[PDB]
């Protein structure tokens, strides 16, 4: 038990006379607090609430001369309960709506006092960070969601942030597979935000999410375009069969309304028109225009040539709808 007893003496010496109230090297240069993150998972990107749920291993290494030890050659990994007895950066996520450290089996924290003094503090944090989502072109949209990391109290003179390993600081984002979002790219930034009090240190980890159109192309656009195609068929039915033609148009319009109401789920109420909203409106007003075209045809009937007007109406509708569709897609794609 000589080795373990000696290690106990060393740890007792380190925690002896250790003032948690003072940052490392108080009355001295800013302490460089490196950060590295391992994104365990990103899930439940709540467009309705404009936020995403992030689960990550949040390591943050910094130098500290007080905790330096030399007797033991190995890297002590003390119990996670010693974190409360040690100074840590007062880091806080600025755009965090609610966050918590995972509970079982014990509070998921890590402490690892290296011989030099470096401390590898780490946490397994789940945070529902919020990113203002610009859904103007949704679903054919991208989102620049981020996790602003900042020191609440200390200023740049007292603490400095930086990604440890630089572009290699953040890991595991590639493996993530969100259900409807492809993480096209992630970018790491270092800033010194100038507030009223002073220049605070800042880090920003932004994932440029991109919407997966496969589900939206499956359920949103395809049924709508099919229903719209049905409306043109009423032009083939001819005018003498008034009842069948008007029945067809009536079914089409009510189908469009049902589509709109059922698709409204899981959508916020941003004022501007969404791309899905624009396309649904376009198809719906086009179907209504088809019904109005039938009305015009019947009114002309009451007032040979009606068949010729029907002939022109035949070709115009697919062509004009195709032009409108191409305009929509090229504008948005």
């Amino acid at each position: 038990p000589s080795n373990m007893s000696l290690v106990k003496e060393t740890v007792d010496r380190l925690l002896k006379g250790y003032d948690i109230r003072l940052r490392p090297d108080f009355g001295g240069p800013p302490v460089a607090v490196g950060m590295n993150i391992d994104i365990a998972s990103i899930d439940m990107v709540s467009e309705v609430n404009m936020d995403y749920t992030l689960t990550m291993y949040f390591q943050q290494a910094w130098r500290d001369k007080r905790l330096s030890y030399n007797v033991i050659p190995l890297n002590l990994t003390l119990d996670n309960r010693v974190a409360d007895q040690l100074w840590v950066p007062d880091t806080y996520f600025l755009n965090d709506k609610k966050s918590f450290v995972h509970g079982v089996t014990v509070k998921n924290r890590m402490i690892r006092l290296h011989p030099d003094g470096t401390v590898l503090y780490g946490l397994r944090i789940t945070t529902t960070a919020a990113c203002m989502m610009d859904l103007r072109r949704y679903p054919l949209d991208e989102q620049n969601c981020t996790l602003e990391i900042e020191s609440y109290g200390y200023t740049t003179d007292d603490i400095e942030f930086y990604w440890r390993g630089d572009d290699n600081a953040v890991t595991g984002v590639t493996k993530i597979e969100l259900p409807q979002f492809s993480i096209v790219d992630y970018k790491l930034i270092t800033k010194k935000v100038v507030f009223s009090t002073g220049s605070y240190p800042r880090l920003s980890l932004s994932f440029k999410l991109k919407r997966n159109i496969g589900y939206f192309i499956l359920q949103t656009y395809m049924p709508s375009i099919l229903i719209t195609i049905l409306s043109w068929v009423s032009f083939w039915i001819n005018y003498d069969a008034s009842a069948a033609r008007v029945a067809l148009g009536i079914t089409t319009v009510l189908t469009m309304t049902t589509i709109n109401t059922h698709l409204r789920e899981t959508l916020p109420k941003i004022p501007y028109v969404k791309a899905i909203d624009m396309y649904l409106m376009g198809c719906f007003v086009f179907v209504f225009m088809a019904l109005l075209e039938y009305a015009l045809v019947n009114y002309i009937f009451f007032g040979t040539d009606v068949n010729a007007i029907d002939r022109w109406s035949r070709i115009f509708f697919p062509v004009v709808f195709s032009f409108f569709n191409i305009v929509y897609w090229l504008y948005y794609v």
């Binding site: 409807q180 589900y215 395809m222 039915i237 069969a241 069948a244 029945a247 067809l248 079914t251 189908t255």
Partner: protein
């Protein structure tokens, strides 16, 4: 499957009765919208078709093709 079979029976009915064919086809198309919406609510919005939306979409195309064929025969009269 039952709706698809109903779409086929629309062929069996007649060709001279335009309104009946029209009504049958349009209502047949209407049903599949609710059917498709109901299935997707439980699942997460995974981009790839989960092989259930695949079957639903194939049936949707089948009934829509029944409408297309109905219109094609209607033209000749």
């Amino acid at each position: 499957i039952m709706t698809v079979i109903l779409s086929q029976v629309s062929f069996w009915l007649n060709r001279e009765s335009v309104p009946a064919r029209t009504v049958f086809g349009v209502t047949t198309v209407l049903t599949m919208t609710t059917l498709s919406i109901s299935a997707r609510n439980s699942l997460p919005k995974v981009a790839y078709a989960t092989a259930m939306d695949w079957f639903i979409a194939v049936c949707y195309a089948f009934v829509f093709s029944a409408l297309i064929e109905f219109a094609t025969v209607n033209y000749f009269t």
